[PDB]
Symmetry: D2
Subunit: 486 residues, 4 copies
Amino acid sequence: ITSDRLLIKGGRIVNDDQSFYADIYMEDGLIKQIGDNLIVPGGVKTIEANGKMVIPGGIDVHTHYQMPYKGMTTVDDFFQGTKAALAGGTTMIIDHVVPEPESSLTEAYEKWREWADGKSCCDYALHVDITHWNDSVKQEVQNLIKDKGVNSFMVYMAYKDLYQVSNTELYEIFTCLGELGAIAQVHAENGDIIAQEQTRMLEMGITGPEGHVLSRPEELEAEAVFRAITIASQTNCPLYVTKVMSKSAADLISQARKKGNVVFGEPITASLGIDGTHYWSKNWAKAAAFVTSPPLSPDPTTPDYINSLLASGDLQLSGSAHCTFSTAQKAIGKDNFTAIPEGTNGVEERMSVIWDKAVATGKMDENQFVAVTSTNAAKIFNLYPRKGRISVGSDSDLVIWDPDAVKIVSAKNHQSAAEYNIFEGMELRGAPLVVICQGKIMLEDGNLHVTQGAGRFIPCSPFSDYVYKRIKARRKMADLHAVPRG
Amino acid sequence: ITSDRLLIKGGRIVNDDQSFYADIYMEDGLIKQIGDNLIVPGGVKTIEANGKMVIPGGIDVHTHYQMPYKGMTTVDDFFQGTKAALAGGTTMIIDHVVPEPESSLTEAYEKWREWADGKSCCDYALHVDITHWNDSVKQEVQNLIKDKGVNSFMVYMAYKDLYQVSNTELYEIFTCLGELGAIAQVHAENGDIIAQEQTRMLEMGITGPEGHVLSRPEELEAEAVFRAITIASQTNCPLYVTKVMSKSAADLISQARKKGNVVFGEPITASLGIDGTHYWSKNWAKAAAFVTSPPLSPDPTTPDYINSLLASGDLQLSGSAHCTFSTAQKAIGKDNFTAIPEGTNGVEERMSVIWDKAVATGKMDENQFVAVTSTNAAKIFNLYPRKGRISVGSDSDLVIWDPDAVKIVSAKNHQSAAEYNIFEGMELRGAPLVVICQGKIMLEDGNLHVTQGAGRFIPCSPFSDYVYKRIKARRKMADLHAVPR
Amino acid sequence: ITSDRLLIKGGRIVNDDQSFYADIYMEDGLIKQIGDNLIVPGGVKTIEANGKMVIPGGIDVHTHYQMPYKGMTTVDDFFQGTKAALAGGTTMIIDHVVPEPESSLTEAYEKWREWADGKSCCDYALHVDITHWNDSVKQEVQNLIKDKGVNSFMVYMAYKDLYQVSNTELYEIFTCLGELGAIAQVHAENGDIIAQEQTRMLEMGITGPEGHVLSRPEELEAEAVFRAITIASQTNCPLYVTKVMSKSAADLISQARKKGNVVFGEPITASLGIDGTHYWSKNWAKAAAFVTSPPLSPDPTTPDYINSLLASGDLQLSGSAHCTFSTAQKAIGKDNFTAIPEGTNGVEERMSVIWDKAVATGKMDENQFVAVTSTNAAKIFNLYPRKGRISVGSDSDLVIWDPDAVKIVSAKNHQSAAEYNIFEGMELRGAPLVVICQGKIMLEDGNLHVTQGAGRFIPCSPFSDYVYKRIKARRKMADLHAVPR
Amino acid sequence: ITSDRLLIKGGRIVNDDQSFYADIYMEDGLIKQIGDNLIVPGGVKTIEANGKMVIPGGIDVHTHYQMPYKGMTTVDDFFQGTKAALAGGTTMIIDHVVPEPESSLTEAYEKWREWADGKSCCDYALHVDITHWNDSVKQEVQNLIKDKGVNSFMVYMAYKDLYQVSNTELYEIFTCLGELGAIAQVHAENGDIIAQEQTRMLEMGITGPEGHVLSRPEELEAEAVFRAITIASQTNCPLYVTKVMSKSAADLISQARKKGNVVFGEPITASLGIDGTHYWSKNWAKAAAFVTSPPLSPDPTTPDYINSLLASGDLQLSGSAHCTFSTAQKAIGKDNFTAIPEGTNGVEERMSVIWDKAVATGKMDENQFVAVTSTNAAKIFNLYPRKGRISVGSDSDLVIWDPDAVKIVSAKNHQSAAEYNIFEGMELRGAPLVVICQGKIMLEDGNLHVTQGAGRFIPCSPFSDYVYKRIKARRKMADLHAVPR
Ligand code: NA
């Protein structure tokens, strides 16, 4: 875990629970001291913060680095993708292991570990996607939680005849994951109806990217979410809705939380920063750059409403779902949108987008910003307070943040290998100046200083208090009752 | 269609759109004249209304008379069940044809027609349940609409491995029924989750009727409805949600209608009049009397909220889902609730319940009462204004109604063959005095005067304007843009 | 009354409750016969409808013809304003009597009748605005309902120190009007907060029309509505919200109706057809053409939503609130928006707008279009079925309507005296071909054939069943007595 | 600040943001150390927690100790009232200074400080009620925030002609308090309508306590809250709704917070634990024990819903609004409910009620319990992390809490001087074992060990980040345009 001593002076420290002035001293990957007039060795490297903010580093809970799809890989791998993370203030990522149906979960995990251990600039952890379900899979799941530092698995309600699962299967999986202390994630979209609406759009000769969005209107995201929430509630399992893109999906989550259901919602940079009118762009490749599932909503009031609910705590946390394909790989579907590979950028811009859209607009303050950028992630995934908090003993991943900075986003300038950036030409308030990860300065003066494979896998235990205390209480509370009769 | 000519004087006529004083003259099953100082043949029978209400007769859009179950039948057949209808002011019923899976739809319809033509006291029509789906069934559906006077079909989202249908099947069926001009009805409950929750309740040794309601909490009715509404909307098909029992199911419908979706909701006497606390009764047979699906809600604020949303038009119409089994037949599940046959009473009490609960409580007036008891049914099912309206040319089925009457309901008294009445001991304001059906007096002074088989089948054409005009318009606009590149 | 005989053949008749093919025969201002192969006199004028629609004529429940303003008058008087009504398919109007504070209500009514009796092309009735309250005013109100054919009064929650009323006053007025059987209308906006926000905007140097809309954001409309609905409910008085312009106001109404509150909502042409982005127009006179209160919302999603709720029955009826001022008169406030006179056009375009926006877009069908354009107005204001219905005995005001017609709106072609039309350049689907009022053809081939003063005042009795049956049930239901202790 | 050394071993520490096992060492009123195998002086007093919970001590944000009333005082003074606090796990209180209309605010504050400094067992702070408004009051408000440690003021929308304020006044006050960095609290009830409904109830001869609740139905609480939220929003002032008693009031707050409005809601023990059916009790004194304003709701589903929204964070914090009168003092109104003094118990039972109702029922976990019982109060009122958190440097006020304890509440056993307890006979899961305040053991083995006047006034600075960061951004954001032309 070795790093130099590091001292940051005159900083204003912003955590999710309060802000305060103090100096921070770091050593060997851990924060050692916080306060004034700190007693420290001489000739230690010192950064002068001058009252600029110091925050916990971002935790992007959703990535797809160098993800397999049909004999291709996404263009940003674990190395270049995490450079893109650190560039934008994110010091940890959580990626999705995707086993082939009938493939082994554990084998896919080993493989993903090898890729990541070897290339990642920063710490990371892993979700494991359950792309098919049967008795051996159920055993692997158990083994991954016990021996492998996984506590999060994702099922698919979409992709009919590929990954899609029946209602019985959902019920059995949520029952299992709940019993084991895991988080049940969902890709919540109704694959059965989408299959029909795709065929209808193609019969109507709408093969461009506009047919992607039109074949998955938000009604079908909504339905899938309502069903998942229902089943998660019958099986007393926590649910986590990934990639929240529509208003109606976010209402349902808000509505379910108020009722007392244990549900989390994960908007992504895309839904928080832009909308879906660009599927209608005359430039085909630009339209295809936005193809991701679920799609960006065409209702332009959507980004504002999603930031409003992230501000209110009705959505709890943000990720990016970074999946990047080259113009060339996207072109594979130039005659049929269903063949366009799905994914966009967003890892580098996540924090800037939310600051620009939710903070600078007076929706949330800097403390709730930290929450939705790192601190809630940490609690959900059982990384708290090691991550998502500046306090003594916590890992020394953190960021000096400039609320008055202004940047234009361009593909010209971004770390991503892709030629397109869906936020191209956008002007964002708020950006990082300095990034420390693992106690080491990894960004300063617009220069990255990274090392490939430095990142460690962070094992995530199950049963995080944040998620499971109310579930435990409900389990034990339960005493159903016969009516005793003659 | 022959009847004696009949004259009702001094009546106050209540239709869904207005009330007014006038005399009514009838002959040969049709209303012939309305107004004052009417001219008539000699020796015509006369009834003196004395300013009491005269309304269109009820249309109960949901029955299961003499419905097959395990080689036995529900105890109220088409004859005795329709006696129970007329006794409570209902002059027409719409029953559900239930084909055995893999059985023919048309064959089941022929068979139902024979049963009903032969026994029914009053006019009737038929829904056809689509209990399984394939290329042949699709053809029967088309034939039934074209040649057989059916315009309403019901799918099941519940009864996994018995009638249950996949989402792909739903989509295909709504697409078909929409194209053909039919009403798509749903039993909206999630069969997949109920199967698990049943097993869990039995593993917990809850075999009594309380396990029936606890294995189908209203979350699962709500989900099924949300999914059905969603699919019906993608396929531009009108949807009709049967047997609305919960507040959450009724909110979704209210919510969908506001947004513009073409959706109807059908509460039943049971949900409108009582609640589900009686699954917990220590008397096993009383608890089982309430076993119906979806179940009565245990949340006792439910009947009041359902009447409130029927009042506000967020639910449009009422039926009874009358399905009666003897104590003996219910007992089949005395060791396991999943073997208890599903169904309750309600045909006889429907109009009294709604009057007592929604009118006498000031939620709806007498005109909206007529709407939810007859006039809206007629419009949905394309029977308007022949039924659900007192005007010249309309069929002469109608009722002299006493708003000041008060009755106690009991099994001791009711037309039903069943030994139990789920509304037992309840006191209801509002009841019929006289019922005319087909132009003939079928109830007076507490005596029924019926004839078995007198009822006619009423063919129901598709594309009712009330349901389909907005659907037709939408297809038209349903033209699709593309980007040119 | 007296009019020639008139026969309209081959028409498709559209009422709120059904459509059907039949011929219509008229004589002396009344519809005499409906059906096929009508037996009639020879050489009667005949119109060939050819399967085009025939509807009841529009009833615009909100107008301000030749309304007094600071020694001005609005530019469209009772004659030219009703020509504009008929030109767009409206055959009746209901105008607002506006007494000067401390002036007599009855004196203002006498004056308004003289104006209207003398000039109006078509039948009409009157709302009476209560701009001040005291013991005497309470007496005039009673007298107007008993002898003068008024049943609708409007209070103001805005215009602080002009017409504005306290909560105590609201309570006393609703209590009175409810007891008397009247409809309580409201201008629902919080005058207290607007006064502040106006001053703040002016101190900020925002004197253009954009300051009008910015000084009355919809939050304040919403608050006034909530408070009105609350008080109406405590006092068991029906409430009628005029000029519904915002989404949040319409949600409250929808929300209140679902609960069972007796509340009606009146959107107007402006809110149904266009939005408020035009207060930001750099052309000053165009911006000022939209100045009305409450203002058009700047949220461009608003017209679509208002039509959606009018479609769903959550708003029941439409008017125009026609109040037109010349470019000159508007210019009075060119240095201070609070001096810009308030009002816009809309009487001529109302039916076309709703058709274009709500029917041709598949939101409502032709039958609900009739309801929101005439039939609901008639029931609320106690004119049904004399108006808002094509049936024997009803008045012969009606319209042959072309759903496939398309018109561009411009002031160049409109009947209004004003130089600006807030719907300028808009293309609308649906327009009238032929308009019959009073049994006489008043529009055909693009020519109006009117007569000044031909219009009759229609007296409107209180206690319309549609509004008051639930109210009466709630009074009579109340049994409040002390807990014996 | 001096206290003995104190060590608590084997405890499970529960804060709003996590739980964990560690030992706690305390000295001189401050927590000194947290963790395992702590290095400490020998022979220090040691408490063995054995894995029982240790939480921050409750902060009851709403009390009325020895409050003036009509030359009467409430029966629990600052000493005995704060004994009642500590007995139930509460280690800080925030009371309401109530100046008589037209008195000095500062003079009332001095007086209140003298009463509290002298008698209070535990730390405290003060809200200041603004019972009348003018230019000097505004000045006092400023002074109190700048020199006197006050950051919270309450206004009254009720009590017409006593404390009630106009909309203009509300606007001016919120504008001021927002500019000054204070929290604007409200008693949100419509005093204008209540005045009428009281009379009517009396004019109806309903003089018992049932008339209290029936003269203030929740419709009127709702309206006031809507109006306050609206005004707070126009004036960019944070709003704090006190004594949230009804579901509809809590929905509005939930609804406003979602929109982004800065609003907080304060349920109280009474609304969280019991309901209002007892105003109908035949025992007059029992009924009068519940008389408080706003009243407990008669809708028995209310407590469950208020706990549900406190669980969800839609209501953020709890207080008790403790205001106790003797049976004798309550009897003053035995002939007229409007003369019954308003208030109830609740300080002692607050934490037990919420645990029983919201935690033991699986609605909220132990961490959100700490938040609604202390941590959120601390942030709102700018006491964090000194209070509402167990961490090194924070004040050593805390509690060892037994989630498996079960107590019956009775007046027989409570610290309050009153003869009645509205939670009489109720069984509550969860109770404190040991209470440490100021580093001193003030409850152990059912014995209180208190010292009168030991409590310190805690000055509360304005502009707490939790409340004002979004407000500052909005004000900062408001650079506005004029349309140049
Ligand atoms: Na005239």
